[PDB]
Curated annotation (Swiss-Prot), chains A, B:
This is Beta-lactoglobulin. Keywords: Allergen, Disulfide bond, Milk protein, Retinol-binding, Secreted, Signal, Transport. One of its GO terms (molecular function) is long-chain fatty acid binding. Disulfide bonds join 66-160, 106-119, 106-121. The keyword Transport applies. Synthesized in mammary gland and secreted in milk. Its main location: secreted. It comes from Bos taurus. PROSITE patterns: LIPOCALIN. It comes from the Eukaryota. Under physiological conditions beta-lactoglobulin exists as an equilibrium mixture of monomeric and dimeric forms. Interaction with LMBR1L which mediates the endocytosis of LGB has been observed in PubMed:17991420, but not in PubMed:23964685.
């Protein structure tokens, strides 16, 4: 609930389709540190269910393979906040989006916020959009982020960004 | 020579003393990735020689120990640029400094610039100065940085920032 910015009037239907994790940022270095870091995940596609929920198709370097995982985000009373699937009463907050280009969101742990806050900047195409990165940074200002990763076109087209 | 910003009228004598690597940034993620990353170095002290050179006292996680290394930077025709000691005809460029608080510099490889550019924000005390970080970012704007690390007081006081 630290993320003071959330989007008003979110139409979860419109955010459906393919996305690229262009930039990542986290409050703790160890969260995004190595390629095998716990929260180093790459979004592939967002699939909203008619029941209001949101399926998230993502990738992660687990063993030595780029594994494809599927997380399901259940909707809450607030249309911009979601509860992800784990003991960890974790929330997925959508900060802003114009639906056609970018989408800014932040995963957070309700128990340990400042120790577990990861945000991302998703874009529709594998192009480095400066205007989306600008908005991402502005939303990051008041947040205690200590690591910020950014990716290039070539990395965006390969699995697990290699 | 990509770093378009360099400081005019640098008095190498004044930058002597203890410093803290408050923030780091690099053009390639693999340069600052893990704790054992090649260019993940922590500045301890800057010792300028009367012969115009500059000794750099730093730390690095090599094996499983936080080793203290000492790099010597030889002066060049330009008072803000230095040549570090290795085959790699590498340069150390000082971008800005008020001598009493911060100091912004960038290490660079003359052979492969965009693939080997690391910059840092050194502060005098282990306090998070927003004004120094602001200046650091402004100087980073035109540079193709893809990773940015930041550290907190507690980390600044421990060897190898742990």
């Amino acid at each position: 609930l630290i993320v003071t910015q959330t989007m008003k009037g979110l139409d979860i239907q419109k955010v459906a389709g393919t996305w690229y994790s262009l930039a990542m940022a986290a409050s703790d270095i160890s969260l995004l540190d190595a390629q095998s870091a716990p929260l180093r995940v790459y979004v592939e596609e967002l699939k909203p269910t008619p029941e209001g929920d949101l399926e998230i198709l993502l990738q992660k370097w687990e063993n030595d393979e780029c594994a494809q995982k599927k997380i399901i985000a259940e909707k809450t009373k607030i249309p911009a906040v979601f509860k992800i699937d784990a003991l960890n009463e974790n929330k997925v907050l959508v900060l802003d989006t114009d639906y056609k280009k970018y989408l800014l969101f932040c995963m957070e742990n309700s128990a340990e916020p400042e120790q577990s806050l990861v945000c991302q900047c998703l874009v529709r195409t594998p192009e480095v959009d400066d205007e989306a990165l600008e908005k991402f940074d502005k939303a990051l200002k008041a947040l205690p982020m200590h690591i910020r990763l950014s990716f290039n076109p070539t990395q965006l087209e390969e699995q697990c960004h290699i």
